[PDB]
mmCIF file of C-alpha atoms in Angstrom:
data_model
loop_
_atom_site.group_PDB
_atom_site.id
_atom_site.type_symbol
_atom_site.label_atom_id
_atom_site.label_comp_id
_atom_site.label_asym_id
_atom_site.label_seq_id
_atom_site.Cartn_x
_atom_site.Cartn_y
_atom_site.Cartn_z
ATOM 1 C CA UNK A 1 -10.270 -10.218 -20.364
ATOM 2 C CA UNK A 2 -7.608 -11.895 -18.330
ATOM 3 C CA UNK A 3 -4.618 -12.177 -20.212
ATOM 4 C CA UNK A 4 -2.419 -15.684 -21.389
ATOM 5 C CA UNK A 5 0.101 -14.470 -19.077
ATOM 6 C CA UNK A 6 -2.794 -13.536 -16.249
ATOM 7 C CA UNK A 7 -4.226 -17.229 -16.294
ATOM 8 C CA UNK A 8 -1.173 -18.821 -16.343
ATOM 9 C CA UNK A 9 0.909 -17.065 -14.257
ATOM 10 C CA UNK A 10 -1.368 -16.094 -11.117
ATOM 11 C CA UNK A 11 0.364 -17.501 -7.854
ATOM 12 C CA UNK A 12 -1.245 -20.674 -6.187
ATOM 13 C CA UNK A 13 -2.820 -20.775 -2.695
ATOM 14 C CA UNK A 14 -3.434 -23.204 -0.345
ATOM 15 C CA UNK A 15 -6.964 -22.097 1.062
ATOM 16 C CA UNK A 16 -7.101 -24.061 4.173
ATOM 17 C CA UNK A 17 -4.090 -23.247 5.503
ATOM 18 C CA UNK A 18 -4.144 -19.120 4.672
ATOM 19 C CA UNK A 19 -8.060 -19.829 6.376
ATOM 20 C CA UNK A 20 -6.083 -21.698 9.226
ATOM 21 C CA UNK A 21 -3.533 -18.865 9.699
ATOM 22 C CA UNK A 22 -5.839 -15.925 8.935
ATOM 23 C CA UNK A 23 -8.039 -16.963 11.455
ATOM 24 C CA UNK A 24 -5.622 -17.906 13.893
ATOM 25 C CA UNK A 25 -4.222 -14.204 13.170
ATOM 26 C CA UNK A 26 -7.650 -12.742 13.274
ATOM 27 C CA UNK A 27 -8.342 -11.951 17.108
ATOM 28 C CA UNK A 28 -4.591 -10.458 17.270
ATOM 29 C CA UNK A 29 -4.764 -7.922 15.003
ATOM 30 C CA UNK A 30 -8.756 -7.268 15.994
ATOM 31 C CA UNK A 31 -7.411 -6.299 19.829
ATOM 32 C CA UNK A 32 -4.658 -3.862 18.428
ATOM 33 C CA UNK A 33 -7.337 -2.067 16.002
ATOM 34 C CA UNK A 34 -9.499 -1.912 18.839
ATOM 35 C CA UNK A 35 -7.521 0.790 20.474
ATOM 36 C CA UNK A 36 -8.233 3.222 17.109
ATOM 37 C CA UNK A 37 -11.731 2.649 16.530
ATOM 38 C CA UNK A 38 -12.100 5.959 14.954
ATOM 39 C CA UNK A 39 -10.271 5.419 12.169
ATOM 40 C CA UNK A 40 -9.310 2.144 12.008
ATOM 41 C CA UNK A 41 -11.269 -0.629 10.214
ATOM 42 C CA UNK A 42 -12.905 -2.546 12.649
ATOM 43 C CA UNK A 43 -14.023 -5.546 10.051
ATOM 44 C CA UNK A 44 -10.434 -6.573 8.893
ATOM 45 C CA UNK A 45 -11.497 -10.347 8.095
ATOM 46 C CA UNK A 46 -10.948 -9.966 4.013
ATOM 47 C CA UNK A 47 -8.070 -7.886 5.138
ATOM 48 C CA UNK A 48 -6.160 -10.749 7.139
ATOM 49 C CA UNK A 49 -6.960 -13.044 5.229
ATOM 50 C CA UNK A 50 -5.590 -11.482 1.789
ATOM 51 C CA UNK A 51 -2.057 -10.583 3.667
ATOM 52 C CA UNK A 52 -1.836 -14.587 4.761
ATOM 53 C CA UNK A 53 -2.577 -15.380 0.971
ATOM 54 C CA UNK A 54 0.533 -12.465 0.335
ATOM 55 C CA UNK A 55 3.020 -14.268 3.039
ATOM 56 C CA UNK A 56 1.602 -17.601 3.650
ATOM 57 C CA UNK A 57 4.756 -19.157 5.531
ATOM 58 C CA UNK A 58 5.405 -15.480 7.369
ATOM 59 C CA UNK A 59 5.937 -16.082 11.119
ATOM 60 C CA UNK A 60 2.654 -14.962 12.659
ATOM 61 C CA UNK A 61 3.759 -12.191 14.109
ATOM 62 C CA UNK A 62 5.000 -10.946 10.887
ATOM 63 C CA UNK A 63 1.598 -11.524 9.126
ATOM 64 C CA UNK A 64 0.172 -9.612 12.770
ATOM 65 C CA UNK A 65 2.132 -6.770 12.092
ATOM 66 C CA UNK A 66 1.836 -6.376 7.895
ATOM 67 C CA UNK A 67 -2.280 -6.941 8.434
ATOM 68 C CA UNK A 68 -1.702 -3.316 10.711
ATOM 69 C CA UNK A 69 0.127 -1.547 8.116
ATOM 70 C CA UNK A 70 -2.141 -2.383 5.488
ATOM 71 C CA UNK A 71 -5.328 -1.658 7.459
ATOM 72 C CA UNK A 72 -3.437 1.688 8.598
ATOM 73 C CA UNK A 73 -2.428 2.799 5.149
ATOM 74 C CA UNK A 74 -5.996 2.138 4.320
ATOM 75 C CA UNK A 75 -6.910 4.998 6.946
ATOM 76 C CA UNK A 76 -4.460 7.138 5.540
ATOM 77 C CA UNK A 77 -6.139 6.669 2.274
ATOM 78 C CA UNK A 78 -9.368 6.963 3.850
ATOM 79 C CA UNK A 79 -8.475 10.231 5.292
ATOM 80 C CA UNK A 80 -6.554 11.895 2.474
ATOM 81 C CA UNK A 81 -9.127 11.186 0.259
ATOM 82 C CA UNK A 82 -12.783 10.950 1.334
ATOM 83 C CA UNK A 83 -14.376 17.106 6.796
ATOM 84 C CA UNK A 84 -10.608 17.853 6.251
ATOM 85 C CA UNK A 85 -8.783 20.718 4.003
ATOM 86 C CA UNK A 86 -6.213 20.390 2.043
ATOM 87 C CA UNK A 87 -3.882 22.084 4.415
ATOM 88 C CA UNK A 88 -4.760 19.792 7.136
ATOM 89 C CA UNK A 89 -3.917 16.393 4.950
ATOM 90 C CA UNK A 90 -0.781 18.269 3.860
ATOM 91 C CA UNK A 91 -0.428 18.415 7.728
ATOM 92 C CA UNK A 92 -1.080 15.003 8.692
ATOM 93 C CA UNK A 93 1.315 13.316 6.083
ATOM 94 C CA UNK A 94 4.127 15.215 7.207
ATOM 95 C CA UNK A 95 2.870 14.144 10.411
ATOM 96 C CA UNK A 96 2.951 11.114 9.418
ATOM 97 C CA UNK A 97 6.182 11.247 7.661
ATOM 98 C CA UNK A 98 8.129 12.750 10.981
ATOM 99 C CA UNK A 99 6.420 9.241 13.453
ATOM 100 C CA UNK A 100 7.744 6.943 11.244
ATOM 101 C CA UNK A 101 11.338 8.395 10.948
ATOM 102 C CA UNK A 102 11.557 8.672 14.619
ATOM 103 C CA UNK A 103 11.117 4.938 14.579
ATOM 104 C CA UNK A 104 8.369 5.036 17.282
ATOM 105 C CA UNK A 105 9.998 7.917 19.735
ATOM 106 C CA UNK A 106 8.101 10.538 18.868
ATOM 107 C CA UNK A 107 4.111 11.418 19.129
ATOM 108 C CA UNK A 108 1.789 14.096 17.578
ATOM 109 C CA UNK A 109 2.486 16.304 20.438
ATOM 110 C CA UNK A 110 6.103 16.524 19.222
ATOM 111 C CA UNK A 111 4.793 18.323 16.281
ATOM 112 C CA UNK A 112 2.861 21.260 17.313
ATOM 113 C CA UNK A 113 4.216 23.099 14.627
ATOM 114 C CA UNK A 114 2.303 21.095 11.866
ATOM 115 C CA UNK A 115 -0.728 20.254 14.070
ATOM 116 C CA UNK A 116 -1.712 24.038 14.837
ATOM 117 C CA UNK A 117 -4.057 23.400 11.892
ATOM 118 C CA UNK A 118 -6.383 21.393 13.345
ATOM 119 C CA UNK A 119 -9.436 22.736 15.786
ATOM 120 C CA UNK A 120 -8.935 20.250 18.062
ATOM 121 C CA UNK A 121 -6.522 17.562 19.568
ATOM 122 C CA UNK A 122 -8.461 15.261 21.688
ATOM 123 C CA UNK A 123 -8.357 11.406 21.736
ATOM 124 C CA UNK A 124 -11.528 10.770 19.959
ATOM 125 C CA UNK A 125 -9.699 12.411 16.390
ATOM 126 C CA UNK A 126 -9.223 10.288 13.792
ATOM 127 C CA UNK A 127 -5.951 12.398 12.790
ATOM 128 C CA UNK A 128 -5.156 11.698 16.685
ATOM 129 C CA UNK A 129 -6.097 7.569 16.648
ATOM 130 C CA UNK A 130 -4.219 7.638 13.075
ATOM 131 C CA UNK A 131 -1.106 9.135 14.784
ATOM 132 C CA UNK A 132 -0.909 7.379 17.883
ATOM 133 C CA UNK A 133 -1.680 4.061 15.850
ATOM 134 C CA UNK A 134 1.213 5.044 13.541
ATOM 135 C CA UNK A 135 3.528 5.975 16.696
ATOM 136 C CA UNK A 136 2.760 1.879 18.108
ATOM 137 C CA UNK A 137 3.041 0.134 15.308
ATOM 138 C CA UNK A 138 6.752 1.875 14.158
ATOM 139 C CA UNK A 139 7.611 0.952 17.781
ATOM 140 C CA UNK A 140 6.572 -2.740 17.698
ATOM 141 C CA UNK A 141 8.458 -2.561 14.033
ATOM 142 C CA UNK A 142 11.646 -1.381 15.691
ATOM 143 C CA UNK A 143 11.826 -4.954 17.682
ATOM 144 C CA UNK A 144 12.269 -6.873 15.083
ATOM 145 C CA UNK A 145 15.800 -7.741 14.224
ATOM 146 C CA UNK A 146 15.314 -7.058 10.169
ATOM 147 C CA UNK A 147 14.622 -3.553 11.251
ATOM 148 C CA UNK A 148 18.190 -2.769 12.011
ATOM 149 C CA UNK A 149 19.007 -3.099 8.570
ATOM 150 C CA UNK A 150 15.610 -2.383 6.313
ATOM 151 C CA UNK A 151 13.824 0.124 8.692
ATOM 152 C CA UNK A 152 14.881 2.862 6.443
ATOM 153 C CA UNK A 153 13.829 1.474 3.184
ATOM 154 C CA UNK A 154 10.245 1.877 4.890
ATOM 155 C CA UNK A 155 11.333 5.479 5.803
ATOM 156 C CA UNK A 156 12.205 5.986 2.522
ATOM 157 C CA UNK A 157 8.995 4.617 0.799
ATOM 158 C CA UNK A 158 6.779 6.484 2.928
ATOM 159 C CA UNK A 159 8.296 10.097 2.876
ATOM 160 C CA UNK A 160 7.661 9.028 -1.443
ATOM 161 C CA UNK A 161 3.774 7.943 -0.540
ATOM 162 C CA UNK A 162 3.529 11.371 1.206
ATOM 163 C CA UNK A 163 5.313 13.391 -1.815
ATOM 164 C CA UNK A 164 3.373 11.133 -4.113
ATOM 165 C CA UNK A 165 -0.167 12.873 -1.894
ATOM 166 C CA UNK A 166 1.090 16.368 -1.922
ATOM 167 C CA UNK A 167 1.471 15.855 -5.630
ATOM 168 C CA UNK A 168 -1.804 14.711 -6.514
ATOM 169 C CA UNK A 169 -3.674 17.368 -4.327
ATOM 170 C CA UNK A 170 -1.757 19.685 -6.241
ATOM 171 C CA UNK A 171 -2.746 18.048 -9.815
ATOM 172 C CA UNK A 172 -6.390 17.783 -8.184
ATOM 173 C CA UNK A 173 -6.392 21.598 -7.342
ATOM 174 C CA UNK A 174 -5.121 22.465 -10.476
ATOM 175 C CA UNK A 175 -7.826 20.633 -12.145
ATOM 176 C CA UNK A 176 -10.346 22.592 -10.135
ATOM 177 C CA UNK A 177 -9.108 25.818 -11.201
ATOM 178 C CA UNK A 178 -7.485 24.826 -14.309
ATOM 179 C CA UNK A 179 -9.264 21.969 -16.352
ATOM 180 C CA UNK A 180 -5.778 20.394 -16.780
ATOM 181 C CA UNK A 181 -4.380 17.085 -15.893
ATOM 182 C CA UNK A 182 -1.067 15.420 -15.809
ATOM 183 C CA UNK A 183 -0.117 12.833 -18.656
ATOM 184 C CA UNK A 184 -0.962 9.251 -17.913
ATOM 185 C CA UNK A 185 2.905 8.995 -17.714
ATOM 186 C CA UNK A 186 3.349 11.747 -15.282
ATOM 187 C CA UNK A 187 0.565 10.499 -13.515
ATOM 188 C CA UNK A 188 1.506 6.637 -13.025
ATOM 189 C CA UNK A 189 5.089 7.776 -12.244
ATOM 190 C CA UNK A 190 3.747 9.564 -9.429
ATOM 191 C CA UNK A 191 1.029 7.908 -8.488
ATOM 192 C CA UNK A 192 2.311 4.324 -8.085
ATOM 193 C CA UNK A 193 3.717 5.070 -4.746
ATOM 194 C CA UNK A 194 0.823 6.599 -3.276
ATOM 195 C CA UNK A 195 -1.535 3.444 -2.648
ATOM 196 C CA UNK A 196 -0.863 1.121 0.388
ATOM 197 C CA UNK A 197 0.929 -1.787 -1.029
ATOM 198 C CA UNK A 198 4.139 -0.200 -1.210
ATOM 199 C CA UNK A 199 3.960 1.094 1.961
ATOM 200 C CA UNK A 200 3.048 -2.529 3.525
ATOM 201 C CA UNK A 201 5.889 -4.261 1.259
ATOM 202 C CA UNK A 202 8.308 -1.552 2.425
ATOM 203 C CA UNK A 203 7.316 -2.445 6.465
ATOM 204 C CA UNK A 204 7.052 -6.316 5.561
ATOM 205 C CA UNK A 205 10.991 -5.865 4.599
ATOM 206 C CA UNK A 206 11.901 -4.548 8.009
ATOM 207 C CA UNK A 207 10.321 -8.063 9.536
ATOM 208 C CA UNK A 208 12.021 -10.383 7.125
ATOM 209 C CA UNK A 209 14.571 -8.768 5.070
ATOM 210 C CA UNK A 210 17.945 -10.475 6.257
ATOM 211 C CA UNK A 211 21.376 -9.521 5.853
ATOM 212 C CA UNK A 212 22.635 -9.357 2.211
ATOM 213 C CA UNK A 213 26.340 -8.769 2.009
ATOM 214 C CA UNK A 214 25.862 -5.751 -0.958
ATOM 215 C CA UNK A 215 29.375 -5.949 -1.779
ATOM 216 C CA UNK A 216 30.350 -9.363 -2.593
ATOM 217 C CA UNK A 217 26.692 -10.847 -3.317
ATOM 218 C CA UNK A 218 24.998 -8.394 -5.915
ATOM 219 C CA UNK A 219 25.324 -9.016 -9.786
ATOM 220 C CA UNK A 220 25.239 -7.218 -12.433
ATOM 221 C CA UNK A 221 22.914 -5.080 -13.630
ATOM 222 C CA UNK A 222 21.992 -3.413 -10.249
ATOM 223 C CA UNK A 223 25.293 -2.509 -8.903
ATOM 224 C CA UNK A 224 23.844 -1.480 -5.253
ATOM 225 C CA UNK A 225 20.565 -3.404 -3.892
ATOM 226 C CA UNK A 226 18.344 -0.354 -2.602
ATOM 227 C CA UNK A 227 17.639 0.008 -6.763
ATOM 228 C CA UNK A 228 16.370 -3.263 -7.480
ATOM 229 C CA UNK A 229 14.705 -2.893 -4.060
ATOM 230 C CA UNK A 230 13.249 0.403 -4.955
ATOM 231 C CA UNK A 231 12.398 -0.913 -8.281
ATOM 232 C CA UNK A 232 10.546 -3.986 -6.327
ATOM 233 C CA UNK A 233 8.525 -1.252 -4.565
ATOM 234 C CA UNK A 234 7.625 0.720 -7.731
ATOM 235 C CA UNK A 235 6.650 -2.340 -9.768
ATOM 236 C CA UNK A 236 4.467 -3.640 -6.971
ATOM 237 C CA UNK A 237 2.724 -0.138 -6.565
ATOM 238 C CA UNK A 238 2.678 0.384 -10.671
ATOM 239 C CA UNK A 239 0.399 -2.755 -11.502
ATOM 240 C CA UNK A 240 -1.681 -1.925 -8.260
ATOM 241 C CA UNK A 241 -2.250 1.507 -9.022
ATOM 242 C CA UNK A 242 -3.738 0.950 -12.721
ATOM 243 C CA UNK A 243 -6.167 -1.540 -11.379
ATOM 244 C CA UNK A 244 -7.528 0.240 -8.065
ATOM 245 C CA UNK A 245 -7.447 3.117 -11.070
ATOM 246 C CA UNK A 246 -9.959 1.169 -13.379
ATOM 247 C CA UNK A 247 -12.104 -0.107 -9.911
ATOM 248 C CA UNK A 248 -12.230 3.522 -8.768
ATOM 249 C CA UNK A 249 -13.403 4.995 -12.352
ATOM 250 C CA UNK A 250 -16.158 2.196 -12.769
ATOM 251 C CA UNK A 251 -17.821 2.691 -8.985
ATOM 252 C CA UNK A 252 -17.667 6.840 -9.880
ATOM 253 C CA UNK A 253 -16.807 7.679 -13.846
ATOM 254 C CA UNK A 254 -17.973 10.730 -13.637
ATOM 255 C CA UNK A 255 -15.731 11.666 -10.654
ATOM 256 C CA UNK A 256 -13.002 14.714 -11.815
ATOM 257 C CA UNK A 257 -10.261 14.255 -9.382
ATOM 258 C CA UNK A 258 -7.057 12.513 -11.755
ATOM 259 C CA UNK A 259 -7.490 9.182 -12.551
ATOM 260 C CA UNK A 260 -5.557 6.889 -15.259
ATOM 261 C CA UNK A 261 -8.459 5.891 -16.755
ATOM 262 C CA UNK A 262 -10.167 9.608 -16.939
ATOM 263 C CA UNK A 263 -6.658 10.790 -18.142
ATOM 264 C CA UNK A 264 -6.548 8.457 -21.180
ATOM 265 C CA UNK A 265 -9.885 9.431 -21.947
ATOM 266 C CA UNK A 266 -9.863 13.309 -21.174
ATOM 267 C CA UNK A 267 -6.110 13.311 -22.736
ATOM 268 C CA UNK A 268 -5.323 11.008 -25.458
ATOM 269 C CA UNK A 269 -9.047 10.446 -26.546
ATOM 270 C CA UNK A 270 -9.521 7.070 -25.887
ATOM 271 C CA UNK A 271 -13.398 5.577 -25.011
ATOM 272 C CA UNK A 272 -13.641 4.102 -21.654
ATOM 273 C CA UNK A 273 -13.473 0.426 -23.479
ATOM 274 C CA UNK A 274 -10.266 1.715 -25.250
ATOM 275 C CA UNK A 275 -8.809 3.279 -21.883
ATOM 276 C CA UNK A 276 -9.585 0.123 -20.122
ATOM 277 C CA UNK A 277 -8.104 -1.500 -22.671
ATOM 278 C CA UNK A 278 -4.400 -0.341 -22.774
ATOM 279 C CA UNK A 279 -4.524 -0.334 -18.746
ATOM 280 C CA UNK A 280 -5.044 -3.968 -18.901
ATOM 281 C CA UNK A 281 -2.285 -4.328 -21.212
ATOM 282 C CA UNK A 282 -0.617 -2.312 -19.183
ATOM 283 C CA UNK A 283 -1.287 -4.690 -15.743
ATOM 284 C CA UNK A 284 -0.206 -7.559 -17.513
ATOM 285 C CA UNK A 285 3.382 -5.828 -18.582
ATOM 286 C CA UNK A 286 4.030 -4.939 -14.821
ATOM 287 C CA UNK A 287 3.059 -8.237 -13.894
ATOM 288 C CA UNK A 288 5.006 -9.398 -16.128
ATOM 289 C CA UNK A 289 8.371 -7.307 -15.304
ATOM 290 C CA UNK A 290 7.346 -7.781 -10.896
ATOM 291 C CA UNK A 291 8.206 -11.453 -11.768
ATOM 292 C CA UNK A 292 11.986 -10.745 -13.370
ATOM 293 C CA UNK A 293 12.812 -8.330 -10.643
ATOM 294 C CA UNK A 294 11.871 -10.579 -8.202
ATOM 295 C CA UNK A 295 14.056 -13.955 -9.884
ATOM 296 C CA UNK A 296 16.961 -10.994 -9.732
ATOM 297 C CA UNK A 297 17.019 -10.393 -5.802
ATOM 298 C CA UNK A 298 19.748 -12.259 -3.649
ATOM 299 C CA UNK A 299 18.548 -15.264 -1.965
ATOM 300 C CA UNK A 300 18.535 -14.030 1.594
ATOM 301 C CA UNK A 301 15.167 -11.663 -0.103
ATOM 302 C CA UNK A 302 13.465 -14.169 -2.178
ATOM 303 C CA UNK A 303 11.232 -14.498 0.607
ATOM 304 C CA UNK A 304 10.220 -10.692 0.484
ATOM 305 C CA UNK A 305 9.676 -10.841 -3.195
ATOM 306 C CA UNK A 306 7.574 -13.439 -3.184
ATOM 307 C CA UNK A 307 5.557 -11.073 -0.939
ATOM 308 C CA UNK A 308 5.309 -8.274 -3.327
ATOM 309 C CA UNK A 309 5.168 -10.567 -6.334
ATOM 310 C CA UNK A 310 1.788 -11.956 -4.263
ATOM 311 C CA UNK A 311 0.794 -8.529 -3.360
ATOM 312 C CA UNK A 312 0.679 -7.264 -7.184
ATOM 313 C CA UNK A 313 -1.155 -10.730 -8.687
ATOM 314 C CA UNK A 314 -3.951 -11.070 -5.883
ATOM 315 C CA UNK A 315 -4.959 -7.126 -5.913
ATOM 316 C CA UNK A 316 -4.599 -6.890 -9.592
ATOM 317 C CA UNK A 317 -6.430 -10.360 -10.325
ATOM 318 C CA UNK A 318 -7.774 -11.912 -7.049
ATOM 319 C CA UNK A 319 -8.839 -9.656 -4.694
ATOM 320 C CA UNK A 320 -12.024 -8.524 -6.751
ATOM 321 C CA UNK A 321 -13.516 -12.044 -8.036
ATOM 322 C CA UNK A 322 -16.342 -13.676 -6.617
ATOM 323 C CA UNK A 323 -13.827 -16.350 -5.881
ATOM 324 C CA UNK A 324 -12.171 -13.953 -3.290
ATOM 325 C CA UNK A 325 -15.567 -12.478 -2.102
ATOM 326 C CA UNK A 326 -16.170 -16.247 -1.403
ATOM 327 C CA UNK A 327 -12.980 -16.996 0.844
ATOM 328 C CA UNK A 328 -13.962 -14.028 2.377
ATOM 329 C CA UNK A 329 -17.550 -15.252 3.159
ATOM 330 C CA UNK A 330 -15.974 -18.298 4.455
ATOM 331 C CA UNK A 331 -13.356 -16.626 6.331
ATOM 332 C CA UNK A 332 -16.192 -14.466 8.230
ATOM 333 C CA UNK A 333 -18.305 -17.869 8.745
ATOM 334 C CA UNK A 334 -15.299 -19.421 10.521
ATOM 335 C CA UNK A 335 -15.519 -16.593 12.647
ATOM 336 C CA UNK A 336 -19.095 -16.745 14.292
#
């Protein structure tokens, strides 16, 4: 069920050199996850590999750093949602939250205040490794000279992916005691920011947004550039969401926690065929509307948006094909 605009549209890749670069990435990033075994993936292969195919003529050390963020926001996934309570994730996102707006100059023990909740503090937590991991790699963003301009849009997005969290636990608790769920609207409004690839877009403009002079270089209709840039973000995160959404319902359908699909279905009456059917649709229009914003941006981003233009195609259409399994097989080949 791809769509006319899925088959034509999907962005091209040159397999031998995002194998090239991915590999050539590979051993950088695997040293820096090393120090966070406990909670960081420690096979990142597919991982690396898929962020080259995002950013294929990145700077290495851009394509270093985005590979972190994406294998850290996987952790926070990981950890928000799969031996913790609920007050203790609401703890660790605000945890979260505080790291990255100190730009690297503050760790966990700053925060005693929101870490009283935990039994215990040592270095072998995964809360800890996710923290101190979160602490480096906002430092390491902070040398890059994008971040003196974009940092904050990151700031930004992830204080949203945290609120974005607290909401859902709250929906997900309600269910619990309630039976009730959020419209599908409610829910994608909400829920397309809390998924990594916003938060990885967000950090990948901090390493190669450049200047954009706002005043004399933006037209009409976005009359100040954090919108469209925002909008980027949300577009991105919106396709994304809908298909993790449909993956997610298919591995566990009879799984309670809100989900688009089991909202369509629980709320609007639709059979699973009928509510996978409109989220496709639905796919396809974001897809569709991530490839206008990005024609809009000024040319000192059109670098970036091809990034999150990438980011939205490959993990809506790519990322789960045989065809991608494959790469990856041949990716972790080129490795032994």
């Amino acid at each position: 069920t791809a769509t006319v605009n899925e088959l034509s549209g999907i962005p091209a890749v040159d397999r031998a050199h995002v194998l090239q670069t991915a590999l050539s990435i590979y051993p950088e990033v695997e040293n820096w996850v090393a120090q966070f075994p406990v909670i960081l993936p420690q096979r990142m292969g597919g991982m690396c590999l898929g962020m080259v195919a995002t950013a294929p003529y990145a700077q290495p050390s851009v394509l270093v750093e985005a590979s972190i963020m994406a294998l850290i926001a996987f952790a926070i996934d990981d950890i928000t949602e799969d031996t913790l309570t609920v007050e203790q994730i609401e703890a660790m996102l605000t945890l979260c939250v505080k790291l990255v707006q100190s730009g690297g100059n503050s760790t966990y023990r700053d925060y005693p205040e929101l870490i009283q909740v935990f039994p215990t503090i040592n270095e072998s937590q995964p809360w800890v490794q996710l923290a101190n991991a979160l602490t480096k790699f906002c430092s390491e963003v902070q040398k890059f000279p994008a971040a003196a301009i974009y940092y904050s849009i990151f700031a930004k997005h992830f204080e949203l992916y945290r609120e974005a969290h607290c909401t859902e636990l709250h929906w997900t608790q309600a269910v619990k005691e309630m039976g009730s769920y959020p419209t599908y609207e409610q829910y994608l409004l909400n829920s397309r920011k809390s998924i990594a690839a916003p938060l990885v877009e967000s950090s990948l403009l901090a390493m190669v947004g450049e200047p954009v002079d706002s005043e004399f270089s933006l037209k009409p209709p976005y009359a100040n550039l954090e919108t469209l840039i925002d909008e980027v973000l949300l577009i991105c995160g919106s396709s994304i969401r809908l298909a993790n959404d449909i993956r997610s319902f298919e591995r566990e359908p009879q799984a309670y926690q809100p989900n688009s699909l089991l909202i369509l279905m629980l709320t609007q009456g639709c059979s699973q065929k009928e509510a996978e059917a409109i989220l496709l649709k639905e796919i396809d229009t974001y897809l569709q509307k991530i490839e206008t914003l990005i024609s809009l941006l000024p040319s000192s981003l059109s670098t970036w948006g091809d990034s999150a233009r990438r980011m939205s195609w490959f993990a809506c259409t790519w990322y789960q094909t045989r065809d991608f399994h494959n790469f990856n097989k041949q990716m972790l080949a080129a490795l032994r």
